[model samples]
Target: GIDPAIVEVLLVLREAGIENGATPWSLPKIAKRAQLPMSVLRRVLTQLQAAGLADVSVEADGRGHASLTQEGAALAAQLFP
Candidate 1:
């Protein structure tokens, strides 16, 4: 199982999406907003992506963006509330 802290990160990402699209969250943005270290956030994001809970894609300018998958969304809904 993933760490509970990772779950917290996922919930924040989901809530960020509720305000706008999840695709806008960059690594720096997520790390800053989540108050997590860049390295820790990277690892957590990678884990979530590998588990199909999250996804990373390139923007038009080739910058990376991260977003939640359907499974992630479900988990976030559960975790957030």
Candidate 2:
């Protein structure tokens, strides 16, 4: 139903969320899990966030975390099934 690359990214994040309760995901971690270059993943993340399919937050401590958005979660429930 969408880009495979983006779907892969979403699936990886969704699985992480399932495995851990609200644990933050690092960019390098996401890049490795999605098997995409950091540069490419960054661009994809921007697109996903703009599309309301992903959410990313940065802490004051300079830590960055990423996860699927609520809209993304609904799709993920179906996609990750």
Candidate 3:
């Protein structure tokens, strides 16, 4: 099972992928959709990345994007399939 902090964020990202075909979601939207605080979401993304389940990055403009790794995508498929 994934950490509670990140689980919802992962779900939202997966939905975005389903709708957009691998497109990543901005951190603000992810946090909003997950109903998690930015602080919690920040730490959770780190945990997911360290676990090799997801990846997080930021654009030059400082907007954050969160996406799943291949393994994470598999988990998402199971969760939302």
Candidate 4:
């Protein structure tokens, strides 16, 4: 089964893409919006990355950006619709 945390994060990413352009979202912002702690967010992002459902770019400062992959967006759309 898909993790509920993963679902929430995906939906938030979808919402961001729809509201703003399809740009990568800042990790801090996503963390705040998803109400997920940094550790949990990192773990969930790793899972998504392994599944090819999302992409993440980590900066040297330890922060990063995240965005949905094609499959991830489609899945989020299905869940939302």
For model 2, residues 1-81, the per-residue Cα lDDT tens digits are: 778788788888888777646676898899899999988888788898999989877678745868988798788889668
Better of 1 and 4 by TM-score: 4
Model 1: per-residue Cα lDDT over 1-81, one tens digit each: 868668667867897678644345787788787888877987898888899998877668755767788788777878777
Q: After superposition, how far is residue 60 of candidate 1 from its true place, in Å?
A: 12
Give per-residue CA lDDT, model 4, range 1-81, as digits (tens): 867788778878888777546568898888889989988888999998899988889878888799888898888788799
lDDT of 4: 0.85
Q: Rank the candidates by TM-score, best first.
A: 4, 2, 3, 1
lDDT of 3: 0.82
RMSD of each: 3.0, 2.5, 2.4, 1.8
Residue 29 lDDT in model 1? 83
**Segments of candidate 2 deviating more than 4 angstroms:** 59-63
Compute each candidate's TM-score over C-alphas: 0.75, 0.80, 0.79, 0.85
Candidate 1: global Cα-lDDT? 0.77
Look at candidate 1 and give me any clashing residue pairs: none
Best by TM-score: 4
Model 3, total clashes: 0
Winner on TM-score (1 vs 3): 3
